[PDB]
Every structure is written in C-alpha cells, then in structure tokens.
Design a protein around this ligand. Structure first.
Ligand SMILES: COc1cc2cc(c1OC)O[C@H](C)CCn1cc(nn1)CCCCOC(=O)[C@@H]1CCCCN1C(=O)[C@H]2C1CCCCC1
Length: 128
C-alpha cells in the first residue's frame, strides 16, 4: 500500500540522509515559494501508524489543521517535510520514530518506536 510505496520510491529529505523522512509528491502544487520557519501553515491531512493500526484526519474535525512552521508545534518530520511543499501539493510522508515520537512514544495514540505515514495537502501559508 501507500506506506510501502514510500519506502520503495520516496525521496530522503533528511539533512543527515538517514531515511528518517521519505516523501512522494502525489499531486503537484504551484508557486516558487515554499513555507519557511515562522509561517502559519494550513493543511488537510490523513495520518496513521504505518501498520494501519490507528488513524487520524483533519477532516474528522471538519477543519484544516493549522500550525506555525519550524516552531516544534508538530513533530520534526512535519517541520522538515512541509517546508518542501508548494501550495496545492499533496504529498506522502513516511517517518521513522527519530523524527516523530521516538522511543518514549506518546501513549495512548503513539507507541514506542512507531513509524508514521501521512498524506498532507498544503492549503496555504502566511508569513509571521
Ligand atoms: C500525539 O498527539 C497527537 C498526535 C496526532 C494528533 C493529535 C495528537 O494530540 C492528541 O491530535 C490532533 C491533531 C487533534 C488535537 N490536537 C493536537 C494538536 N493540535 N490539535 C497539537 C499536537 C499535535 C501533535 O501531532 C503531530 O505533531 C502530528 C503532525 C500534525 C498532525 C497530527 N500529528 C500526529 O502525530 C497525530 C497522530 C498521527 C498518527 C495516528 C495517531 C495520531
């Protein structure tokens, strides 16, 4: 399925090149600009434990998910990954625990050493 396809075909967007955050662009966006640290970012997303065991979508709450980029309001993988995206882009991310919730996890939703999968649509972003 989609997690395995990211494993096989995704780009490693980590600085360390440790395969900690792998990306596939599923729908191309527009514009020269990508978000930068500080911007208010609007997304829709579907996320799950990569083994399908738990799911979460912004659509469940009938509203976009909003955060400030590069401020650690989200897991590291989102600060890295969303910074690569264009407005209108849909991307798949597959994320090792080091760029998510680590060995501690974040129970009850996230166990120790969990790999995460997200589909993210970047709706908009605005400068601080
Ligand atoms: C581990 O805790 C959670 C994980 C995830 C979602 C969580 C969450 O909180 C309980 O709640 C939803 C986003 C709704 C409430 N909320 C929380 C925050 N803003 N709104 C702020 C904190 C968000 C932390 O989440 C994240 O950094 C990532 C990336 C942004 C979307 C949500 N993220 C998650 O890790 C989900 C998780 C995905 C895998 C399946 C279980 C939920």
């Amino acid at each position: 399925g989609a997690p395995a396809t990211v494993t096989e075909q995704g780009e490693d967007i980590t600085s360390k090149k440790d395969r900690g955050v792998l990306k596939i662009v599923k729908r191309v966006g527009n514009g020269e600009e990508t978000p930068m640290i500080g911007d208010k970012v609007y997304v829709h997303y579907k996320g799950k434990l990569s083994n399908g065991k738990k799911f979460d979508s912004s659509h469940d709450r009938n509203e976009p998910f909003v955060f400030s980029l590069g401020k650690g309001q989200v897991i590291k993988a989102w600060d890295i990954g969303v910074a690569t995206m264009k407005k209108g882009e849909i991307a798949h991310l597959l994320i090792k625990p080091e760029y998510a919730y680590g060995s501690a996890g974040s129970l009850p939703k996230i166990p120790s050493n969990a790999t995460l999968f997200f589909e993210i649509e970047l709706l908009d972003f605005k400068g601080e």
